[PDB]
Design a protein around this ligand. Structure first.
Ligand SMILES: CCCCCCCCCCCCCCCCCC(=O)OC[C@H](CO[C@@H]1O[C@H](CO[C@H]2O[C@H](CO)[C@H](O)[C@H](O)[C@H]2O)[C@H](O)[C@H](O)[C@H]1O)OC(=O)CCCCCCCCCCCCCCCCC
Ligand SMILES: CCCCCCCCCCCCCCCCCC(=O)OC[C@H](CO[C@@H]1O[C@H](CO[C@H]2O[C@H](CO)[C@H](O)[C@H](O)[C@H]2O)[C@H](O)[C@H](O)[C@H]1O)OC(=O)CCCCCCCCCCCCCCCCC
Ligand code: CLA
Ligand code: CLA
Ligand code: CLA
Ligand code: CLA
Ligand code: CLA
Ligand code: CLA
Ligand SMILES: CCCCCCCCCCCCCCCCCC(=O)OC[C@H](CO[C@@H]1O[C@H](CO)[C@H](O)[C@H](O)[C@H]1O)OC(=O)CCCCCCCCCCCCCCCCC
Ligand SMILES: CC1=C(\C=C/C(C)=C/C=C/C(C)=C/C=C/C=C(C)/C=C/C=C(C)/C=C/C2=C(C)CCCC2(C)C)C(C)(C)CCC1
Ligand code: OEX
Ligand SMILES: [Ca+2]
Ligand SMILES: [Cl-]
Ligand SMILES: [Cl-]
Ligand SMILES: [Fe+2]
Lengths: 30, 35, 135, 334, 453, 341, 78
């Protein structure tokens, strides 16, 4: 079966869309 | 002050201009004529 | 072909005779075809009544037959159904109805004589078009 | 200080992870409703009858279809251009069968895509920058105007005009070629040359910096590393990159100063696509690309085949096959 | 000390951005607009002077592809009855009165740009205007608004006094009739503004029964006058002084918005409306022609002896007369989208519910179908160059339907003016904030702000 | 010097057009196939290849003018002017094909001569090339559409025809006969080009949004001596701008430019390996699912089965008129017509 | 910097460039006008004249049928 296979890889892509916004490293100037 | 007349670019710009306005003329001639 | 004279022969009158048509009256017959014979007779199809095509498979079958161009300038003088039963000069451009259809004022008999000669020269030079258009 | 200035002074503040400021006050609610409704209509929306007769066409992942084949599957032909909200439906089953959740992710999305275009202005005033990036975002917000709203207004109903989905985007294009002929149209043909130039000018200027970069590292590490973010010295010498692309084409063919070059990367794709987005806005009113069919012809008067009728013999076949039930009358001018 | 002139290096502006030498020059900016208003007036006569002498009065008005002569025939300069044109001489004199009025509007834009004074302001204390003496800048809007509302009352004195405006809802097709009662009552005309902008309701576009148009310019004339003598007598308020930027460009960047706002709506008056723009002069809209395609095939199959109703289509639905979602019996097929159609023909087929079948049989007269047969072949469907109908049809007739041929040509311009409004508002907000030329070297404003993370 | 070094001191001079020691393969083969193409649009024609009038001489106004193809019954033979078919005759040559053979071949041989050229100037100024690396986008499109697509299929009639509308036929060829949309190798290429078109638009904006204004003037294009080591855009305000609006931001000024190289070059390379699947027509038009209950079940109603009947609208409508090689003629009730249209 | 040859703005401001282009640009333009008004392009290049597409014996849209001797087939058609 297949219907949960799309929703898995969709919301696992959407989880990195949350993580890269919040847990971006701070750029430091030098 | 003394600048040469012919160079490589005199042959570079005449090629694709001597076949340009000879073809411009061809297009005009083709356009006047009818079926 | 060069569009010679003897492929531009077609019977101009009822059932007995033809005539030869020169080149320049066809092109103003083409010009009046693209002005007044135009919005409902592109490619020979009739857009408002969809099976009254100008194909000579179907132009012969409307009685009395519409291949004679003296009959065909009479059938723009007096338009009709396929049987000649009632006039449809309510619903058709004509010279009988010029007060209804105002585009037919700047026209003559000979300005209809060449567009009648134009409209059946076109299926003499092509087979699919002036027909279903998709054959 | 003041109770309302504590708000008006929090929301316009720079130190937040995203800018919530005044264009965001319309944006952040009315785009996130279109986010929540998009994930739910992609998954479990009941089918919606695009054709306007009866036929409920499915585009949700619970109903057996792939993520390529899924859609929001836009609203019905029977509502037309009516405002059909969730409350003028008698029930939500009446809503979702008859084109409900498409208009919820159009009027919420088009509001939320315009206030982003105001929000990109608003921080550029709230910092020291010169504010000319809302005009740069006026190009793919216009593509959101055309095929979502502007083309669906002038064509008639809200039925035609989705990109919503993947295959429904490809179904929408092939009918817009079929119905009214995208291809031989001089705003779309000007528009794709902006994108194809913008394809090249990304790969050209992005190469020529990465070419002419100075040495600051050794071969074993990355060359993306040795300098620090925020430095004032330019990492690549602009005089070396100019006399290489100059040496390639000719000397005055290349931009001597880089500040004029970056205007040209922000000109050629951005002037291009809002000609292509003003193709579809011109296509909204059935002002189509020109037909060269039956153009050349023998002195006999026999037709001569071109490429254009060979496009048309492909174009008539999608027109004679699309919307295979709904046409009762011999012209598709609806 | 200054008085450099017009070069690159005195003003900081180049050969492009080729006006901004005239932001602060008051006098030569007047020579910009008067040469420009002479140029708008020059097109306004010479298009009609080209439209006449490419006109034929026997052929209908939309056929020859002309867009100004249907503007004139709405006011009714010599249209007889039903959309026939009886006299073309008022169409000729209205353009020569614009062709000669461009030359005296052309002398001003060359005197005030070349020979006249550069310092417009410094004079007899009238014009001057420092884009910042607010009390003076409201008087410019006050001088225009008592003239804008006086041009607004020039339509009603055309309609109620000189002959009359054209009316498509007239019995007997359409005819000029002198309107004797426009509506003053604001619960239906200001109630147009409070309506939905969607199908059905139609916010400013569906404005049928022509005596509400003449009621508009009574009510728009008596507000622009009362707005005009507001801005002479008073100043802007306290909140308006601190909410609206207040300088040259921007003080000119607000005209790109409400404008782009104007020709959005004017790209829908020419697309959906059938009473401010008549279909006998402009041609039919998209809603009209698709009802007309279904209508001529109905009365054909009514005359071919076939019970209309009892006909299911190819789909289960009714081929001719199905029902809309809210009960009004409408035309079938793909014409469910234009079920809100309210043209002049088939309004004698409207019953109490809708298209009523007591009168859909035995009350089709031969005038009604031949109008709809005309609009079916004249649908808005064209090419770039000329060729009408659908594209898979060959090129026969050439017809672009100047409803459709005008709707896009404002929508190119209405979209573009929303751009340069937004583009001028950038240079506006960086005019009074001083970073129009970019950020500073030393006092960078980002470094005062703290870290994000 | 020697015998060869005197020649290498010639072609690496500072002439105004740089001729290049790799340019002797370019400059013959790039003036031909530009000027070989420019006679094929005007003078030489089709109508002996596949029955079409595609020249300025027959009178089509450039949006359907193209030097076409050879015929379908002719195979993959390189019509060579002096070849078997050619028989040393200009006429017929072009009339039966040529050109497109000629132009295609010479164009293919040049594109080598241009990518050899930008490698050659890159050593002369010592510059570390990536333009030749970023020309592998453009050379893999040409050799896998105009060259390696027809050699999988039948002979070069099915290759695209050189014109604006001759390409437009080849577009609607690949919709109907192959479904070149919705196979995934094409769809990365739309992510390549449209992703490439943003990243030059969004990078063209911010260098004109963060400026120093060193001059006392107004025009922003001035005050920029090329021999200037201090950098003209901010990157500290631009990172502060895009960390707030989009939430993600380029936190170093290099790899902002490497990403603009990478995003359309790997777009075309994924697009280049799709049409080599189309060359042997491994199309992936069919889904293994979503078709059996398009057969058993009329209640299963989706966009993909709506889209797959549109491609049947291509393959039986234009194919008698596109290919008159087989003389396909159709009796007008075998064609798929949906309804009244 | 400089390149060694004469710049273009110093070329077209010379009278010597335009005495050699008053009878040369309309010389080469009229040479293109005689290429089709004499109909040399109909015979040198292979185009059909727009009265000699279809003959009396041929109406069936001419196509190359055999691969090996295409020239012979073309000659057969006319
Ligand atoms: C906020 C943005 C508004 C636009 C959002 C989409 C709304 C759809 C729409 O825009 O619709 C445009 C509407 C008008 O809608 C049309 O209004 C029509 C009114 O015509 C009526 O009146 C006409 C008189 O000529 C005829 O009689 C006509 O047959 C009759 O139906 C009908 O109601 C149509 O169903 C309906 O499509 O508003 C208008 O004109 C003005 C619209 C302003 C925005 C334009 C954006 C482009
Ligand atoms: C890379 C290089 C890129 C640049 C390459 C060079 C291109 C330059 C830009 C284009 C310039 C056009 C060339 C002018 C020739 C021309 O076009 O000539 C065409 C016409 C004039 O030709 C006449 O055009 C007529 C058009 O039909 C008209 O008349 C017919 C017969 O009565 C019918 O009535 C029909 O309804 C009516 O429209 C007929 O075809 C005549 O036979 C014919 O002589 O030019 C006109 O009038 C034009 C009108 C002038 C003002 C334009 C206003 C446009 C407003 C609509 C735009 C909306 C968006 C459209 C998308 C595109
Ligand atoms: C009511 C309209 C209006 C007015 C009066 C102004 C006034 C001004 N604008 Mg402006 N602008 C507007 C609308 C307006 N704007 C809109 C809507 C746009 C978006 C398109 C622009 C875009 C624009 C640019 C791009 C910029 C300005 C600038 C300026 C200033 C200098 C103008 C100058 O030098 O011209 C310059 C004129 C030219 C360079 C000529 C260009 C001609 C174009 C290319 C023609 C376009 C095609 C045209 C239809 C012809 C077709 C022919 C056909 C045969 C093909 C001046 C204050 C500048 C500024 O900020 O200064 C303060 C600036 O840099 N304008
Ligand atoms: C609607 C179009 C329009 C109008 C009305 C103007 C008007 C003006 N521009 Mg302008 N401009 C325009 C478009 C326009 N521009 C465009 C598209 C560009 C970009 C190329 C520019 C670029 C530009 C620059 C860079 C400058 C101006 C300046 C000026 C002003 C003074 C001109 C001057 O001193 O030279 C006088 C010019 C002449 C004496 C030459 C003779 C030309 C004649 C007068 C033209 C009219 C002849 C006409 C056919 C006869 C009419 C017949 C009669 C019976 C009425 C003037 C108000 C200048 C300014 O700011 O003033 C200080 C300036 O610096 N403009
Ligand atoms: C937008 C239009 C406009 C504006 C605001 C101005 C403004 C000005 N002009 Mg001017 N002018 C214009 C257009 C304009 N002009 C045109 C089109 C021309 C060519 C005919 C001239 C020719 C012109 C000359 C030759 C002179 C001026 C002068 C002046 C200045 C002093 C005004 C004065 O004392 O007049 C006095 C005003 C009157 C005696 C009242 C007469 C009013 C008119 C004729 C009656 C008609 C009004 C009309 C019915 C209103 C509706 C218009 C309708 C037809 C559309 C002033 C700054 C003078 C100047 O620059 O100073 C040296 C000057 O000598 N103007
Ligand atoms: C086009 C002509 C014109 C122009 C340019 C102006 C310009 C101005 N007027 Mg003015 N005025 C005019 C006509 C005009 N007026 C007329 C005809 C009248 C008579 C009714 C008035 C009555 C008038 C008074 C009574 C006042 C002004 C004021 C002002 C100033 C600021 C406007 C403001 O902040 O309101 C902008 C409006 C808002 C910020 C409120 C939002 C309005 C709605 C809710 C926004 C939604 C609009 C929506 C997008 C479109 C749908 C339309 C409708 C359904 C709502 C400005 C100088 C003010 C001023 O400075 O005092 C002198 C003021 O108090 N005017
Ligand atoms: C703004 C109100 C308004 C509206 C809705 C109309 C509408 C109409 N007029 Mg009309 N007119 C107006 C003002 C208006 N006019 C004024 C002020 C004048 C005098 C110059 C005229 C003079 C006039 C004539 C002489 C004729 C018309 C005609 C017409 C009809 C067709 C033309 C058309 O498409 O109009 C397009 C309408 C618009 C583009 C107006 C949109 C403006 C929106 C609704 C408001 C924008 C506000 C703006 C942004 C400022 C903000 C306010 C600020 C204080 C904040 C149409 C019903 C013609 C017709 O067919 O009648 C028989 C005709 O003959 N009118
Ligand atoms: C959707 C297009 C759009 C966009 C993106 C903007 C963007 C902006 N407008 Mg604006 N404007 C527009 C249409 C638009 N406008 C129209 C149609 C009008 C005519 C009524 C105006 C009239 C206008 C004025 C009078 C002013 C602005 C101003 C501004 C700036 C922000 C503050 C503000 O008033 O926001 C308000 C936003 C809107 C009214 C439209 C947003 C639409 C949402 C989706 C609803 C910003 C650049 C200000 C400025 O920069 O002055 C120099 C300012 O004072 N606008
Ligand atoms: C937030 C989203 C939560 C997940 C939503 C899951 C929906 C799953 C679904 O509809 O699948 C529906 C399918 C069931 O589908 C069944 O498949 C069988 C295969 O032998 C049958 O043959 C039938 O096809 C069908 O009854 O779910 C499964 O395949 C069950 C196993 C995988 C479940 C993993 C969940 C973790
Ligand atoms: C007769 C007529 C009519 C009537 C009436 C009228 C004339 C009306 C008008 C009315 C009006 C009178 C309207 C108005 C409107 C308004 C507007 C359009 C405004 C706008 C503005 C804006 C939107 C802005 C705002 C703001 C913001 C947002 C921010 C800043 C601040 C401010 C506040 C400024 C009609 C239509 C029926 C039709 C015909 C004609
Ligand atoms: O349905 Mn969807 O769609 Ca694009 O067209 Mn018009 O209406 Mn139908 O047509 Mn051809
Ligand atoms: Ca006549
Ligand atoms: Cl379909
Ligand atoms: Cl139908
Ligand atoms: Fe940069």
């Amino acid at each position: 079966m297949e219907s949960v296979a799309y929703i898995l890889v969709l919301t696992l892509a959407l989880g990195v869309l949350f993580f890269a916004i919040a847990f971006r490293e701070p750029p430091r100037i030098g | 002050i003394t600048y040469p007349i012919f160079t490589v670019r005199w042959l570079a710009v005449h090629t694709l201009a001597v076949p340009t306005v000879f073809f411009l003329g061809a297009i005009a001639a083709m356009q006047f004529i009818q079926r | 072909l060069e569009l010679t004279e003897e492929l531009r022969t077609f019977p101009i009158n009822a059932q007995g005779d033809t005539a030869v048509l020169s080149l320049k009256e066809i092109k103003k017959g083409q010009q009046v075809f693209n002005a007044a014979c135009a919005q409902c007779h592109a490619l020979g199809v009739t857009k408002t009544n969809p099976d009254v095509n100008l194909s000579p498979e179907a132009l012969a079958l409307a009685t009395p037959p519409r291949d004679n161009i003296a009959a065909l300038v009479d059938y723009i003088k007096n338009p009709t159904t396929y049987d000649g039963f009632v006039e449809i000069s309510e619903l058709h451009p004509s010279l009988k109805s010029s007060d209804i259809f105002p585009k037919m004022r700047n026209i003559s008999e000979d300005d209809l004589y060449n567009v009648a000669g134009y409209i059946l020269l076109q299926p003499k030079v092509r087979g699919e078009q002036w027909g279903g258009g998709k054959y | 200080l003041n109770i309302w200035e504590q708000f008006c002074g929090w929301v316009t503040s720079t130190n937040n992870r995203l800018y919530v400021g005044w264009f965001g006050i319309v944006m952040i609610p009315t785009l996130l409703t279109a986010t929540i409704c998009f994930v739910l209509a992609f998954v479990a929306a009941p089918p919606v009858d695009i054709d306007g007769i009866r036929e409920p066409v499915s585009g949700s992942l619970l109903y057996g279809n792939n993520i390529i084949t899924a859609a929001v599957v836009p609203s019905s032909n029977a509502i037309g251009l009516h405002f059909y909200p969730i409350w003028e439906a008698a029930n939500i089953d009446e809503w979702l069968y008859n084109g409900g959740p498409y208009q919820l992710i159009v009027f919420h999305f088009l509001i939320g895509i315009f206030c982003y275009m105001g929000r990109e202005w608003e921080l550029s005033y709230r910092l020291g920058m010169r504010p000319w990036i809302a005009v740069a975002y006026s190009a793919p917000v216009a593509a959101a105007t055309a095929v979502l709203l502007v083309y669906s207004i002038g064509q008639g109903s809200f039925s035609d005009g989705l990109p919503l989905g993947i295959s429904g985007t490809f179904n929408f294009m092939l009918v817009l070629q079929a119905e009214h002929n995208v291809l031989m149209h001089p705003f779309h043909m000007l528009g794709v040359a902006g994108v194809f130039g913008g394809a090249l000018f990304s790969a050209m200027h992005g190469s020529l910096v990465t070419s002419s970069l100075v040495r600051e590292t050794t071969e074993i590490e990355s060359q993306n590393r040795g300098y620090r973010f925020g430095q004032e010295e330019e990492t690549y010498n602009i005089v070396a990159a100019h006399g290489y692309f100059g040496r390639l084409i000719f000397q005055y063919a290349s931009f001597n100063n880089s500040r004029a070059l970056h205007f040209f990367l922000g000109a050629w794709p951005v002037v291009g696509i809002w000609f292509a987005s003003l193709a579809v806005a011109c296509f909204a009113f059935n002002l189509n690309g020109f037909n060269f069919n039956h153009s050349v012809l023998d002195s006999q008067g026999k037709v001569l085949n071109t490429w254009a009728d060979v496009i048309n013999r492909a174009n008539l076949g999608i027109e004679a096959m699309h919307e295979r039930n709904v046409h009762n009358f011999p012209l598709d001018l609806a | 000390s200054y008085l450099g002139g017009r070069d690159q290096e005195s003003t900081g502006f180049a050969w492009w951005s080729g006006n901004a030498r005239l932001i602060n020059l008051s006098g030569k900016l007047l020579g910009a607009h008067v040469a420009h208003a002479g140029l708008i007036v020059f097109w306004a006569g010479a298009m009609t002077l080209f439209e006449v002498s490419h006109f034929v009065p026997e052929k209908p008005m939309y056929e020859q592809g002309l867009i100004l002569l249907p503007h004139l025939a709405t006011q009714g300069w010599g249209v007889g009855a039903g959309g026939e044109v009886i006299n073309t001489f008022p169409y000729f004199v209205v353009g020569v009165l614009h062709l000669i009025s461009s030359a005296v509007l052309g002398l001003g834009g060359i005197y005030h740009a070349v020979r006249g004074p550069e310092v417009l302001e410094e004079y007899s204390s009238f014009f001057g205007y420092d884009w910042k003496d607010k009390n003076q800048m409201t008087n410019i809007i006050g001088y225009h608004l008592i003239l804008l509302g006086c041009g607004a009352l020039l339509l009603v004195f055309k309609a109620m006094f000189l002959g009359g405006v054209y009316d498509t809802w007239a019995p007997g097709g359409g005819d000029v009739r002198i309107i004797n009662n426009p509506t003053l009552n604001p619960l239906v005309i200001f109630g147009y503004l409070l309506k939905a902008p969607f199908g059905g309701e139609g916010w400013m576009i569906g404005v049928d029964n022509m005596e509400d148009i003449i009621g508009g310019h009574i009510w728009i004339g008596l507000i622009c006058i009362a707005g005009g003598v507001w801005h002479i007598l008073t100043k802007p308020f306290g909140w308006a002084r601190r909410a609206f930027i207040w300088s040259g460009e921007a003080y000119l960047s607000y005209s790109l918005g409400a404008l782009s706002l104007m020709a959005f709506i004017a790209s829908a008056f020419v697309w959906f409306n059938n009473t401010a723009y008549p279909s006998e002069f402009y041609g039919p809209t998209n809603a009209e022609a698709s009802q007309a395609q279904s209508f001529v095939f109905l009365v054909r199959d009514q005359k071919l002896g076939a019970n209309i109703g009892s006909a299911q289509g190819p789909t289960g639905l009714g081929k001719y007369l199905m029902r809309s979602p809210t009960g009004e019996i409408i035309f079938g097929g793909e014409t469910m989208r234009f079920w809100d159609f309210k043209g002049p023909w088939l309004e004698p087929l409207r019953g109490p519910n809708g298209l009523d079948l007591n009168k859909l049989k035995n009350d089709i007269q031969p005038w009604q179908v031949r109008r709809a047969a005309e609009y079916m072949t004249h649908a808005p469907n064209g090419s770039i160059n000329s060729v009408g109908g659908i594209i898979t049809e060959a090129q026969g007739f050439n017809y672009v339907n100047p409803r459709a041929w005008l709707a896009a040509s404002h929508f190119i311009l209405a979209f573009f003016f929303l751009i340069g409004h937004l583009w001028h508002a950038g240079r506006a907000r960086a005019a009074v904030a001083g970073f129009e030329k970019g950020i500073d070297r030393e006092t960078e404003p980002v470094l005062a702000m703290p870290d994000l993370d | 010097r020697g015998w060869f070094d005197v020649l290498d001191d010639w072609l690496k001079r500072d002439r105004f057009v740089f001729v290049g020691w790799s340019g002797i393969l370019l400059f013959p083969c790039a003036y031909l196939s530009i000027g070989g193409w420019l006679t094929g649009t005007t003078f030489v024609t089709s109508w002996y290849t596949h029955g079409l009038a595609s020249s300025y001489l027959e009178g089509c106004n450039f949006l359907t003018a193209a030097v076409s193809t050879p015929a379908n019954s002719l195979g993959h033979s390189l019509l060579f002017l002096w070849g078997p078919e050619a028989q040393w005759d200009f006429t017929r040559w072009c009339q039966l094909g040529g050109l497109w053979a000629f132009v295609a071949l010479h164009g293919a041989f040049a594109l080598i001569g241009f990518c050899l050229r930008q490698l050659e100037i890159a050593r002369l100024v010592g510059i570390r090339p990536y333009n030749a690396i970023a020309f592998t986008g453009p050379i893999a499109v040409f050799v896998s559409v105009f060259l390696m697509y027809p050699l999988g299929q039948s002979g070069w009639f099915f290759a695209p025809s050189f014109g604006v509308a001759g390409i437009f036929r080849f577009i609607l060829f690949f919709q109907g006969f192959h479904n070149w949309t919705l196979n995934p190798f094409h769809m990365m290429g739309v992510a390549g080009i449209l992703g490439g078109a943003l990243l030059c638009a969004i990078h063209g904006a911010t260098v004109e949004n963060t400026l120093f204004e060193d001059g006392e003037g107004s025009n922003t294009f001035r005050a920029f001596e090329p021999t200037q080591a201090e950098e003209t855009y901010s990157m500290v305000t631009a990172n502060r701008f895009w960390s707030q609006i989009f939430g993600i931001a380029f936190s170093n000024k290099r790899w902002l430019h490497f990403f603009m190289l990478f995003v359309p070059v790997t777009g075309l390379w994924m697009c280049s390996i799709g049409v080599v699947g189309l060359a042997v027509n491994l199309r992936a038009y069919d889904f293994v699912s979503q078709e059996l209950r398009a057969a058993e079940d009329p209640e299963f109603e989706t966009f993909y089965t709506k889209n797959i009947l549109l491609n049947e609208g291509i393959r039986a409508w234009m194919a008698p008129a596109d290919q008159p090689h087989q003389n396909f003629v159709f009796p007008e009730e075998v064609l798929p017509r949906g309804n009244a249209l | 910097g400089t390149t060694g040859e004469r710049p273009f703005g110093d070329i077209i401001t010379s009278v010597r460039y335009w005495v050699i282009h008053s009878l040369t640009i309309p010389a080469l333009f009229i040479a293109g006008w005689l290429f089709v008004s004499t109909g040399l392009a109909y015979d040198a290049f292979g185009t059909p004249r727009p009265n000699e597409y279809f003959t009396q014996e041929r109406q069936e849209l001419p196509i190359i049928t055999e691969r090996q001797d295409s020239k012979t087939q073309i000659q057969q058609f006319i």
